[PDB]
Ligand binder design. Structure first.
Ligand SMILES: Nc1nc2c(ncn2[C@@H]2O[C@H](COP(=O)(O)OP(=O)(O)OP(=O)(O)O)[C@@H](O)[C@H]2O)c(=O)[nH]1
Ligand SMILES: Nc1nc2c(ncn2[C@@H]2O[C@H](COP(=O)(O)OP(=O)(O)OP(=O)(O)O)[C@@H](O)[C@H]2O)c(=O)[nH]1
Ligand SMILES: Nc1nc2c(ncn2[C@@H]2O[C@H](COP(=O)(O)OP(=O)(O)OP(=O)(O)O)[C@@H](O)[C@H]2O)c(=O)[nH]1
Ligand SMILES: [Mg+2]
Ligand SMILES: [Mg+2]
Ligand SMILES: [Mg+2]
Lengths: 242, 242, 242
């Protein structure tokens, strides 16, 4: 039965799943999970065939389901507000970044700023890559069978980054030399620079999100109690691997 | 009178119009027309000098003139809704894609998904190019004098794609070898990657749209009864063409 | 005291500030200031490490603090409106473009259109670069110590461009030959194509904006009475300069 052609059809499916990751036919993904004091979750899908590059502005990071200038002016300039509310309830408590598919985690950047998006003391001194944006080594490398994904979690806090904005970018891993934006390829990937624009959802709790979305879309994930929710494809190979 | 310099000035204008298509000085366009049960039309202009790449999210495809989480959760995960409305009235009935200007129709992709934008059974198995996205050969090639344009129509239906999202991309035709993203050109076109961002309008009926917009902007179009509405520039040439 | 190591630390800071402009580690910026009849200002930050490319649509250019189809249809097609309001109060009176950081002003384009974004008489005749979009030579070159920035101001008026849309793009100055989108570099900058998406603020008056934002973020600026508000870093060099 182990060598029945039907089983080998199953084998083909699972070899396909693992090889699809490295293939040019798959997407790379960054999912940004935002956790609010009300226990709800706002989720952003960032995705592209080869290169993810997105800004999540303040209005993208606050809770838009359990929900202005008087407050906004106070997070625009120092002491410039006219609001009796010091900190908006709907600003996120924590985040998790999940990088999955064929991401080269070494190319990831997660650059979290305050409301004005301006790093440092003034615009002409801003650095394109502040040290805290070089987050690659701080991701945790998770494995589920032959699948590999990466997580990075943290708190936004009660300071400037409690009114957050985020720039996120990552490249598809290239294990060989022909660049996915080499001149013979660039136009085909440039045509897909917006496949797909950032996409969001909201869920009342993490547990309900896991049942209705994480599991249904087979998105790799780690819960608050540190449980891996991810598909698992066991490795198939006819010969030893180094 | 046929060889009066004034007539030759007219000739210059019309030769200009036909040659402008192939020139680097023109835009390529994809117009997405969305037809609602109320007979109104929402229209998206997608445009770029060399490379169109856009996502039309669910909120871009529904009728925003004749117009949430309780319903949205039901199209996010299976059986996860809390809405007495099964299908929103404002979801589009049908679409037409019009590709015009110097498009290379062979490079077009029209990738229509459900609300979650995720092709296939799970994110790690999604294909960047599902077979139904390779729509080039299904477009109808329309001619109006020397002008050429392409149309593709269809129904969204009452299933997952009745809650649609769309990725659309196409390149400008290059009849020669110097790529419009060759290293000596790439930076100049990269600087125009967002000339222009997707732009929308709404019209109460197709007939009123044709008078007030299709004709006024000289946009090639085909009505519901299959009538071509397009400018016509008759071909001018001093010698036979193969 | 002039050669105390503490002073030389100050010298290092200021040499850093001037050299940071030309370094790959800085951003380029275009700020678009929009001035309304109510004396308020809406401000857009456009920014990127190497290449700015943005559309400011009509809803981005009108006053969204001191604030539809019946009017919108009238600026979509000629005489197609159903509004008793001829011109919306919230459309901007004037603009100023501030290009700063290491911009190559020779690559700037400021293309202002009417509501439909369509240059010329019809879409197939639109030019990607209308003459008025080649604004480089019309900018005023401002200096503040070793800093250089560029301003361009004007009125929107009471015609088509009184219902404005804008495409803006500019490249980082490259004083040498290795292109920032050369094949060996392109993927790293493509990954940052959306660092950062366009970002806006609003201020009740120019004077309050200058105190709470222009000065706080050290953004180069020129007020309505023609006063330069900009940081100043005096040039430091140990030898004569040509
Ligand atoms: N990384 C970093 N964060 C800073 C800095 N200065 C202030 N912060 C803010 O510090 C916050 C988190 O720091 P914590 O020390 O845990 O304080 P908190 O829980 O936010 O509450 P506060 O004491 O009010 O800051 C974030 O919201 C940041 O915006 C800084 O220099 N570097
Ligand atoms: N192309 C494609 N469409 C599918 C598939 N499964 C379901 N659909 C949906 O089928 C719908 C159109 O199919 P039809 O057979 O004409 O049915 P309908 O008019 O939408 O009404 P239903 O019978 O409820 O599906 C679209 O909304 C699709 O989302 C599939 O496997 N392939
Ligand atoms: N550059 C340019 N602007 C034009 C043209 N035709 C109309 N305009 C409009 O003219 C307006 C500014 O021109 P002005 O002569 O100062 O007139 P105005 O103050 O806007 O008031 P009007 O007399 O109603 O136009 C802008 O809003 C433009 O949209 C044109 O051919 N070229
Ligand atoms: Mg803090
Ligand atoms: Mg169906
Ligand atoms: Mg005018």
């Amino acid at each position: 039965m182990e060598n029945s052609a039907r089983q080998v059809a199953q084998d083909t499916r699972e070899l396909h799943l693992l090889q699809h990751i490295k293939s040019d036919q798959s997407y790379i993904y960054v999912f940004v999970f935002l956790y609010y004091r009300d226990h709800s979750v706002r989720v952003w899908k960032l995705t592209n065939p080869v290169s993810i590059s997105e800004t999540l502005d303040y209005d993208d990071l606050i809770n838009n389901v359990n929900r202005a200038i008087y407050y906004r002016e106070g997070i625009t300039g120092n002491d410039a507000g006219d609001s009796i509310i010091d900190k908006a309830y709907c600003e996120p408590v924590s985040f998790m970044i999940v990088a999955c598919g064929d991401v080269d985690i070494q190319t990831i950047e997660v650059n979290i700023q305050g409301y004005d998006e301006i790093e440092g003391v003034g615009i002409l001194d801003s650095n394109v890559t502040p040290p805290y944006a070089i987050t690659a080594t701080k991701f945790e490398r998770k494995t589920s069978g032959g699948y590999i994904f990466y997580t990075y979690c943290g708190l936004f806090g009660h300071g400037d980054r409690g009114h957050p904005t985020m720039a996120v970018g990552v490249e598809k891993k290239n294990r060989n030399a022909f660049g996915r934006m080499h001149p013979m390829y660039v136009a085909a990937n440039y045509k897909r620079r917006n496949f797909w624009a950032k996409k969001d959802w909201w869920f009342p709790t993490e547990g309900q999100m896991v049942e209705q979305f994480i599991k249904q879309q087979s998105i790799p994930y780690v819960t608050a109690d540190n449980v891996m929710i991810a598909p698992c494809v066991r490795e198939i190979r006819h010969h030893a691997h180094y």
